Structures are given as structure tokens and as C-alpha cells.
């Protein structure tokens, strides 16, 4: 029963592909297993830029030894639910606030 935003095995390119597809918009996001760092996760989010138009940005979600997650060292969370709630409430460094999970 994965959360609506959790796409365990989706590649970075397929995340981009789906996030940029109809049904999604600015703020649309998903969390998937990182293709760069084994055992960690990546956050993919759609954003609208002045010149780029529609774009997707990726953030590495780093793991804290013995439990915990952070995108920026300055603020950590005990779990992904807390992290998603935090960035849903404030962009706090990110390119935009997390709005709705990727629609498929």
C-alpha cells in the first residue's frame, strides 16, 4: 500500500516523463529509489520556470544513520511522511512547494 507519491522502482527518466505528462502540473512530485545512491531515495518535482517552461528537478534524499531523512543537512526528519508534510507546507529551499503526487 504505497503512498500516492511513492514510486519505488520508477527510473529518473520515467519520473520526468510522467511528471511532465498531462494530468500533472507545477508542484507535482514523487519519491522513488535513487538510481545514484543505493539504499536511498530521490524526490522528483515539476516546476514552471521563466524561460524553461515546464521542467522537473530532482533532489537527493539523504539517510541518517539509524533512521532519518534530509535534503538539506540543516533540517532533518524522522521519516518521509514528515519530510513530505514539511515541504508541502513550505518550499524551504526547494524550487517549489510539494503540491500533489504524480497522477497516472
Amino acid at each position: 500500500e504505497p503512498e500516492p507519491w511513492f514510486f519505488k522502482n520508477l527510473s529518473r527518466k520515467d519520473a520526468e516523463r510522467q511528471l511532465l505528462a498531462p494530468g500533472n502540473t507545477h508542484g507535482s512530485f514523487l519519491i522513488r529509489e535513487s538510481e545514484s545512491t543505493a539504499g536511498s531515495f530521490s524526490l522528483s518535482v515539476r516546476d514552471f520556470d521563466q524561460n524553461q517552461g515546464e521542467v522537473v528537478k530532482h533532489y537527493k534524499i539523504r539517510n541518517l544513520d539509524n533512521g532519518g531523512f534530509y535534503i538539506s543537512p540543516r533540517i532533518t526528519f524522522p521519516g518521509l511522511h514528515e519530510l513530505v508534510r514539511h515541504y508541502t507546507n513550505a518550499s524551504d529551499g526547494l524550487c517549489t512547494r510539494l503540491s500533489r503526487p504524480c497522477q497516472t
Partner: peptide, 4 residues
Amino acid sequence: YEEG
């Protein structure tokens, strides 16, 4: 990757 982008940095937050």
C-alpha cells in the same frame, strides 16, 4: 541533482 538540485540542492535545497
